[PDB]
RNA sequence: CGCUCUAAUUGGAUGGAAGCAGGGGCGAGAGCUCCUGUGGACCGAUUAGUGACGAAAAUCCUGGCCAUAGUAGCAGCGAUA
RNA sequence: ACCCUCAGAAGGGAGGCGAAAUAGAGCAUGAAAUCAGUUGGCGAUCGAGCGACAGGGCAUACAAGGUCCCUUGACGAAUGACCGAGACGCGAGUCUCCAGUAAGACUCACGGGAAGCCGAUGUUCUGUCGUACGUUUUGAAAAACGAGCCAGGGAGUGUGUC
């Protein structure tokens, strides 16, 4: 009738009162783009950043509304650096024997792009019977 | 023909550019104003050095041109949007929503701010924006 | 060449096409524009009257340097490009066959699409003063036409 | 951090690889990764290597395209047809 | 192929083959600049390094993100009272007490609500700062030099000795 998709979408994992709070910083807090500069000015300048190397260059002097220059102060939390926003710790699998050594109550899954739909099967039924989201679920027809 | 609004001031021996100052600030705090008996309204100091000021202005200009009132009527509409941001969309509708009138079109007589009066009996060095128009070049139409 | 950029069901339409046609581009737009929303048959009366001269096709976008026009409505000029009209009488003409093969009454159908495209320009060369030569070039033009039922 | 090719270990693909388009997640960031569509035969990861390895700029080179513009020219000549 | 159309071995339409014609002839894929048609936003009273950060309007199929609003309550850093009671000052106003109390960012809990709803993307309005970039120069937005745009190309390599 309708899609439903494999799995436990709706699991969520179970974190300390701290990484729960230092999660719930990064998503209010955020950082910025951090866009190369002028990027928006002309089409062949990128938007991947750029370190602004120009003597002259606003960004470069600090000149505040000309963007926020790269620093090591724009970090996340070590803690939660790195987290899915659901709180998970991603695992890339590949093939079915990846799935060892995943602890389903921090760990959910992530199956590449290459594997087709006959693996794909194989690796959806056997993370669900060992408790572990896949985060990137086959939609059947159900 | 009708405006409805919110204060009527009348301008009767009050000094201009403190009128228009409270008129200004009330305009943005998002009231309509509307300022009565302009021909009767008062400037301070040596009536020789004020005319030479507002004649100067009526000789201003180019092919772009420069339009300042001589009528009583709009040189307290002028110097009411030299106290707005006029160019501004909020300063704009603030500006709009202030009239000036020759006179008197309501029944209702409008009030005198605090601070702004003028006293006759104190003071003899002023002059009245219909003196100043009728030195300008206007038509006495009051 | 194109393919239609839009889509169509067979029982309620007929399809048309102009290809590599050597004609102004920047006419063809002005004439596809104009004639969107009239009838096949309007249409064609339209081009008719823009050959002989009685009927201004308004030229929008470009149009510099080009006079104002009386006859024009809700803008200033206009010009008679005969050429172009020519060729879209001439996709005007095969939409209206095709549609009567299957059965429509061609010279009542709405033009639901009317779409120039500028497919290349056929290569020339002018011979300039000093030793120097300059592109002379001709604009090679497809028009996509779709008849719709009423 | 990213690029190529070699070697060891180990993986993915016609149950659809790379590439591209649009969209989601990640890392301060270089980048990384997934979803959808297109595509229809290749493609990774780790380690240790190799280098014709990273671009916005040089009146840079080559190609392609836009504005210019339906614009100048298609009149001027003792041969005005 | 056949049929229709056309002045027509053209082109067009229908149709046929193939997994695929958007594989149909410079015919694997098909980026950018750019063009046409069209969708969302803006728009004929209004001001210009085109944006960064904030915050509102409008717009959104799924997937890959799932959060967000309000009553109330817990916690509660620096900071931090109104009113009132007493006491000073020509005066605006002040001191003491009430009290480091009420309050106070963030976070959490019960209950309640939203699914274009939260994020995010597009556009646009407001606030804030804001005269590109690279180079030359004591000083560049510069009336100092370079580029029309895009793509691809484009500069510490080799041997020998130290
Ligand atoms: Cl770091
Ligand atoms: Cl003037
Ligand atoms: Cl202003
Ligand atoms: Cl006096
Ligand atoms: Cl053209
Ligand atoms: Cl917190
Ligand atoms: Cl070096
Ligand atoms: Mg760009
Ligand atoms: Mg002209
Ligand atoms: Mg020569
Ligand atoms: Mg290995
Ligand atoms: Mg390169
Ligand atoms: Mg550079
Ligand atoms: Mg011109
Ligand atoms: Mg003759
Ligand atoms: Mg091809
Ligand atoms: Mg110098
Ligand atoms: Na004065
Ligand atoms: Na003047
Ligand atoms: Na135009
Ligand atoms: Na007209
Ligand atoms: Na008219
Ligand atoms: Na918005
Ligand atoms: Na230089
Ligand atoms: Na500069
Ligand atoms: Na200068
Ligand atoms: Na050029
Ligand atoms: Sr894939
Ligand atoms: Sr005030
Ligand atoms: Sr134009
Ligand atoms: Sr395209
Ligand atoms: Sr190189
Ligand atoms: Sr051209
Ligand atoms: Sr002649
Ligand atoms: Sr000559
Ligand atoms: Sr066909
Ligand atoms: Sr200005
Ligand atoms: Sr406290």
């Given at each position: 009738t309708e899609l439903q998709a494999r799995g436990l979408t709706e699991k969520t994992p179970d974190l300390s009162d701290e990484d729960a709070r230092l999660?719930?910083?990064?998503?209010?807090?955020?950082?910025?783009?951090?866009?190369?500069?002028?990027?928006?000015?002309?089409?062949?300048?990128?938007?991947?950043?750029?370190?602004?190397?120009?003597?002259?260059?606003?960004?470069?002097?600090?000149?505040?509304?000309?963007?926020?220059?790269?620093?090591?102060?724009?970090?996340?939390?070590?803690?939660?650096?790195?987290?899915?926003?659901?709180?998970?710790?991603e695992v890339r699998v590949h093939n079915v024997d990846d799935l060892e050594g995943v602890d389903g109550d921090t760990e959910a899954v992530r199956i590449a792009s290459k594997?087709?739909?006959?693996?794909?099967?194989?690796?959806?039924?056997?993370?669900?019977?060992?408790?572990?989201?896949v985060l990137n679920p086959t939609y059947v027809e159900v | 023909?009708?405006?409805?609004?919110?204060?009527?001031?009348?301008?009767?021996?009050?000094?201009?550019?403190?009128?228009?100052?409270?008129?200004?600030?009330?305009?943005?705090?998002?009231?309509?104003?509307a300022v009565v008996n302009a021909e009767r309204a008062v400037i301070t100091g040596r009536e020789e050095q004020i005319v030479e000021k507002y004649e100067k202005?009526?000789?201003?200009?180019?092919?772009?041109?420069?339009?300042?009132?001589?009528?009583?009527?709009?040189?307290?509409?002028?110097?009411?949007?030299?106290?707005?941001?006029?160019?501004?969309?909020?300063?704009?509708?603030?500006?709009?929503?202030?009239?000036?009138?020759l006179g008197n079109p309501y029944d209702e007589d409008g009030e005198v701010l605090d601070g702004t009066s003028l006293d006759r009996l104190s003071?003899?060095?002023?002059?009245?924006?219909?003196?100043?128009?009728?030195?300008?070049?206007?038509?006495?139409?009051? | 060449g194109i393919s239609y950029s839009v889509e169509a069901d067979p029982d309620t339409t007929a399809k048309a096409m102009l290809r590599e046609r050597q004609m102004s581009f920047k006419h063809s737009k002005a004439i596809a524009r104009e004639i969107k929303g009239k009838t096949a048959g309007e249409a064609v009366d339209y081009l008719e009257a823009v050959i002989e001269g009685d009927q201004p096709v308004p030229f929008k976008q470009h149009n510099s340097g080009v006079g104002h026009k009386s006859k024009v409505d809700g803008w200033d000029a206009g010009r008679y490009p005969e050429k172009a009209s020519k060729a879209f009488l001439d996709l005007l003409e095969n939409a209206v066959g095709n549609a009567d093969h299957q059965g429509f009454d061609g010279e009542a159908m709405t033009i639901k699409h009317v779409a120039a495209h500028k497919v290349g320009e056929q290569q020339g060369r002018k011979p300039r003063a000093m030793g120097r030569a300059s592109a002379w070039n001709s604009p090679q033009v497809d028009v996509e036409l779709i008849l719709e039922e009423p």
């Open positions: 999660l719930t910083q990064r998503h209010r807090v955020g950082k910025p783009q951090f866009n190369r500069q002028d990027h928006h000015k002309k089409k062949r300048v990128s938007t991947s950043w750029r370190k602004p190397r120009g003597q002259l260059s606003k960004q470069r002097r600090g000149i505040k509304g000309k963007g926020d220059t790269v620093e090591a102060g724009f970090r996340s939390p070590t803690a939660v650096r790195g987290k899915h926003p659901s709180g998970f710790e594997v087709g739909a006959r693996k794909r099967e194989r690796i959806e039924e056997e993370a669900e019977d060992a408790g572990i989201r | 023909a009708e405006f409805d609004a919110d204060v009527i001031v009348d301008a009767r021996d009050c000094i201009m550019g403190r009128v228009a100052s409270q008129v200004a600030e009330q305009a943005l705090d998002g009231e309509t104003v202005r009526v000789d201003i200009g180019n092919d772009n041109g420069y339009f300042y009132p001589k009528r009583p009527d709009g040189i307290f509409k002028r110097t009411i949007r030299g106290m707005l941001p006029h160019k501004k969309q909020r300063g704009r509708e603030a500006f709009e929503s202030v009239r000036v009138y003071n003899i060095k002023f002059v009245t924006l219909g003196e100043i128009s009728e030195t300008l070049g206007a038509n006495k139409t009051w | -």
